[model samples]
Target: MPQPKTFGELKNLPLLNTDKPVQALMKIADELGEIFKFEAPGRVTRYLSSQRLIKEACDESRFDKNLSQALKFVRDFAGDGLATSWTHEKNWKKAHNILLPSFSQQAMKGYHAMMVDIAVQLVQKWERLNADEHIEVPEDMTRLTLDTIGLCGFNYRFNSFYRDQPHPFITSMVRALDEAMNKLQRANPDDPAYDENKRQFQEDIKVMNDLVDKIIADRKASGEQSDDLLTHMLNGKDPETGEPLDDENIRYQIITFLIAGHETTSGLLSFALYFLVKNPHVLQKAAEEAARVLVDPVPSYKQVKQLKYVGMVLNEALRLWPTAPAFSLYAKEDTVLGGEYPLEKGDELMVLIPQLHRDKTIWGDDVEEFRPERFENPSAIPQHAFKPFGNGQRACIGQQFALHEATLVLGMMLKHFDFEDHTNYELDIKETLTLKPEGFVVKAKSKKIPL
Candidate 1:
């Protein structure tokens, strides 16, 4: 492949090949494996620094002092005070007021509904023995996540899988975030285009706010005390203040859930599917592990723990295709990063995580290969070298949630089906806010279990 001179030329070249899903997965895995081995102090410093933000938000002391205030502090710190403050304010306020209170009830029901849909599809289309037989593990996992978010964050269904038409608000918000991330990646801070991108992001947020408000109003009018996040927010008093969360506080928390919940898991499942098709040996290992570990008809949380190699497969996938590839933080004052680079106040420092994960110094040679055994004893690698969910206070709050959902979904898929590589095409990575495959596709079939 020839190097293109301009962005336009680069865009014109096939960045994604949908036809060959397995080949594309292999190509990306190879590229990322090599990239993860390079040592870059600048990247490590930024990630660790940001993870600190997440720790603070979840700190028991902080939550006791003031849950709403603690959350506010985390959002402001993570987005950097000025760059994303307004958007956060608007979205968080809406979430606190409307979304959070009603989320749990809606999500539980939605999850059941979605599962029922999958069960029906499995019997009708795939001709499996039961609802569990022919389920597309990735798709079902995504539905679970979306349903969780909807019930816990917004008090709504989102109907992400069941409805033929996706909710406009959900679709629009995703697009807006994608656009905003793209602009942030390419535009220099000093450039006027950055401001314009922020403005556009604000507009998208407004759309999200309007939808949340309507949901809140309708639920309140109906006198519904559903078993959702909203009900928890409404019923529970603050541990310290002894006051329930007001509307604004509830809205902010819900919006936070919405933003954090969906993106990473969806991309993760996509990457998992991609790799499962490309790396037959690794996939086989995962399937074998899943079969041996899961003794019960349905895998329990305890059974998931027994599937260590399966966990490694998930870790490997995250290492290779972290949804949020890079994170940014502003220098509070003149300081040094990694003891070498001078940091001036107001300077924007981006930690390129993908680059760090690929560092050879940390991972050693054969870093690019899909080797799950490397994680059997993880004491060999330095702590700071591999950070897919980031590190420090600003680490992702939903890290546990994401891992649980991913493992369940992956385990289910491996047990039931054999994914076929319909398209043996090379991957064209499109660097949006998240790293996404441009043209990745695959066909799945039920694996015949030997009686």
Candidate 2:
């Protein structure tokens, strides 16, 4: 059998568009066919560009999540937290078992008002923006989601809306995450610049650790019983192990929840707005649905679930631009891929989400079009064709949480404002560990609801 094609030379790397790897990969994949390889200095990385190949790779028995590259770098701060931890790490398994139920529909009910609380803050903030002001969608969405997770995951508040600058924790976290990702991309780690970079990275990590530690310590010291995620972890026992998470593990989990949940959801919200404004008909349908279903000022959990059209819009937005973009998987055992390419254990393969989502055979000739109606029949859509979240046991545990949160905020935005891209901004994605629409500015006019 023929092996997959490879980019044989170092100079060819630029063709992959290192600066905006997501779009680059999609463009390259169009040229490279279903699978291709790039051999970096010491390692070989494979990219899967189609659904069928990715589906074969998704088999749990044959493959598992590979926490390498950016995710491995994330471990410096996240430790054994859910997102960055190894699949076999006991902490990951234990925490997953304990926290899985916390995001359930039953558990979501508890966080609904708090979700609305944050959503209202966003709407109120937007309502106050002058008609001429161009709102930076990414920044505002980050504030909304950062505050949402802070309040819902724990009882603490970043109160991001009230501040002109981000909270120190967010600032430091952004710096460290960006630096960590950059560190991986740079060729010379021993460079004097990176020495300073590493120094700052370690320091920022400490800032995060100290803050999360104090939150844990405060919760432990406080005598009050609350139902937030922090309280749940403090009190929760692993279903199988019957062991509670240690303080350090809980801190990592908290950091993981924020780092994993906030940027991703924020990107989702921002990209959805980008798409909605770009597609007026879709926005109109979403807005009408939001107005019809979200009759209450703050949507109830039931009402939020009924925002199906909005949900479809979010799904379509994710299809075009999966906020978390791509996920890496490695072989758990030696096996062939696509019944042709030979595989080896521990070899890393990156699944390109945008490419997978745009397969013409599955999504039709209009695959590139922004049509939320495609998701109306969920079952008609093929399995594994639309995984904005990752794959398998380690797929985003926060899937329901994110969807609920996005639906609430997007639905609220639709109900309250008319969005516009007055500057005629072209979609430029800013890539870090996650993907977001960069410099995507829009104006919002408050909708006047009938008395």
Q: What lDDT tens digits, residue by residue, belong to model 2 across residues 1-451?
A: 2133345655345454377877877877888778888666577778887888999988889999987688888888989999998888899899999999998878888898888888888888877777587798999999999999999887889999999888889888999899878866677689786688888888999999999899889888985667689999998999899999999999998899999999999999998988889899888999999989988756888999899999999999999889888888889888999888989888889898889999887899898899999999788999888889888888989999999999988988888888878999998888888899899898888886431
Model 2 lDDT at residue 365: 87
Model 1 per-residue lDDT at 285: 91
- Quote the lDDT for 201 in model 2: 88
Off by over 4 Å in 2: 1-17, 449-451
Residue-by-residue lDDT tens digits, candidate 1, 1-451: 1121123433412322243322343344344432111112232222222222323322322221111112233343123221123323443333333332233322333333333333333323433434333334345444556665675454687766665456776665666655544432252555886787567667766777677667766776887776556666656664434456565555555665665666667677767767777899888899888878765556565665567887788778777777766554555556554444454664444345555566666677776777767777778756666677754434554566566656766676677666766668466655544555556665566665421
Each prediction's TM-score versus the true structure? 0.66, 0.96
Candidate 1 runs further than 4 Å off: 1-144, 152-155, 182-207, 218-227, 236-244, 448-451
lDDT of each: 0.53, 0.86
The global Cα lDDT (0 to 1) of model 1 is 0.53
**What's model 1's lDDT at 435?**
58
Model 1: how far is 95 from its true place, Å? 11
Q: Which ten residues in a row have the lowest lDDT in candidate 2?
A: 1-10
- What's the C-alpha lDDT at position 321 in model 2? 88
lDDT over C-alpha atoms for residue 426 of model 2: 94
Candidate 1 lDDT at 47 equals 26
